[PDB]
Amino acid sequence: YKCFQCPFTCNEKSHLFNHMKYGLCKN
Numbered sequence: 001y002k003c004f005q006c007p008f009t010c011n012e013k014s015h016l017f018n019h020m021k022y023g024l025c026k027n
């Protein structure tokens, strides 16, 4: 997916959520 919080992308949203919820990059 796509993440503006920090240059990050993944195979699917489920990972974006995890990436957003993991606190790796908060906005």
Ligand SMILES: [Zn+2]
Binding pocket: 003, 004, 005, 006, 007, 008, 019, 025
């Ligand atoms: Zn991000």
